[PDB]
């Protein structure tokens, strides 16, 4: 579609046009949900273990003879019912990550971007240039654009000073156009993207 283009000073320039194949599709809610769940799961580290009756220290001999003592028959002091005994089943190290069909992945990314554009939470700026990194100046830039909610700042590769000035703000998350994810876009309430970043995004998708 067409999105208003703003200059860093905050004054709006002439609109720009975005590819409809990417920013103009009907978002697929279920596909977006699947992508979010898969990404969150992949973030998991999954390092967690317990000691079963074999792994627990000691516990070899039979505590007492099978019959005669009048006590319940036992085989080891480390059986699961014993205090300090092994754990039955329980967590074991494993990976929670899985992969979707490439077409599902692509559709999810396009859906989230198109949702932002449709809701008008996508703000395209002609360029974010800082001679030196200053978080105050980037905060002033956000104020000029009238952004005060969570914002994802998408920058073309090489805009290191913009990234440095923007990253430390609590409401801001900085990502490069080459490295953007469904989770990042969905988490951000607004998406501030430079014109070069939008071009690179369209090329990537």
């Amino acid at each position: 579609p067409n999105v208003a283009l703003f200059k860093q000073d905050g004054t709006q320039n002439g609109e720009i046009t975005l590819n409809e194949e990417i920013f103009g599709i009907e978002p697929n809610e279920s596909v977006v949900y699947d992508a979010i769940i898969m990404q969150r799961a992949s973030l998991r580290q999954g390092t967690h273990a317990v000691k079963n009756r074999s792994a627990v220290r000691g516990g070899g001999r039979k505590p007492w003879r099978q019959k005669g003592t009048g006590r319940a028959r036992q085989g080891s002091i480390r059986s699961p019912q014993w205090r300090g005994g092994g754990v039955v089943f329980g967590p074991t190290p494993r990976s929670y990550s899985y992969k979707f069909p490439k077409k599902v992945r692509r559709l999810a990314m396009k859906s989230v971007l198109s949702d932002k554009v449709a809701e008008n939470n996508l703000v395209a700026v002609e360029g974010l240039s800082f001679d030196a990194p200053k978080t105050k100046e980037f905060k002033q830039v956000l104020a000029n654009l009238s952004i005060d909610t969570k914002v994802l700042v998408v920058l073309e590769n090489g805009n290191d000073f913009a990234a440095l000035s923007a990253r430390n703000l609590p409401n801001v998350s900085v990502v490069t156009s080459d490295n953007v994810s469904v989770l990042d876009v969905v988490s951000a309430n607004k998406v501030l993207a430079t014109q070069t970043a939008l071009t690179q995004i369209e090329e990537v998708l």
Partner: protein
């Protein structure tokens, strides 16, 4: 979608059923295993196909046949697929692979006459059925054995 309003598609996910968690759940106590017996034990049950000692079906039945070491299987293609090409096109195993019609050619392409051909084509393949060759020739095309 918003992370605080996620909603799976209806019927996409179900709740795991946990057994041995009270009687009212319907799987308390015996956990749906019944009362005693081999199948009610941990690790219980007999091996697949076991029949309690009666001679199993495979034991009853005789072995048959052999596998040819020089067996050749041909990737099969029909006139219906051939219709996907234009008149005068040169159909080749490479062409089929690029089009994605035959991803795995196996011993080679054999052409069968299941469909009805309509385009004039010069078809090259390992083998041709008699009906397929006649149909290709009748469609004004030609056939060659690679």
């Amino acid at each position: 979608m918003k992370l605080h309003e996620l909603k799976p598609a209806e019927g996409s996910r179900q709740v795991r059923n946990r057994v041995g968690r009270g009687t009212s759940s319907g799987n308390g106590k015996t956990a749906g295993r019944g009362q005693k017996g081999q199948k009610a034990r941990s690790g219980g049950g007999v091996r697949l196909g076991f029949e309690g000692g009666q001679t199993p079906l495979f034991r009853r039945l005789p072995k048959r046949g052999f596998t040819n070491i020089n067996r050749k299987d041909y990737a099969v293609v029909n006139l219906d697929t051939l219709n996907r090409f234009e008149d005068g096109t040169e159909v080749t195993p490479v062409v089929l692979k690029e089009a994605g019609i035959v991803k795995n050619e196996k011993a080679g392409i054999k052409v069968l006459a299941d469909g009805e051909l309509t385009k004039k084509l010069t078809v090259k393949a390992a083998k041709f059925s008699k009906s397929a060759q006649e149909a290709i020739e009748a469609a004004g095309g030609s056939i060659e054995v690679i």
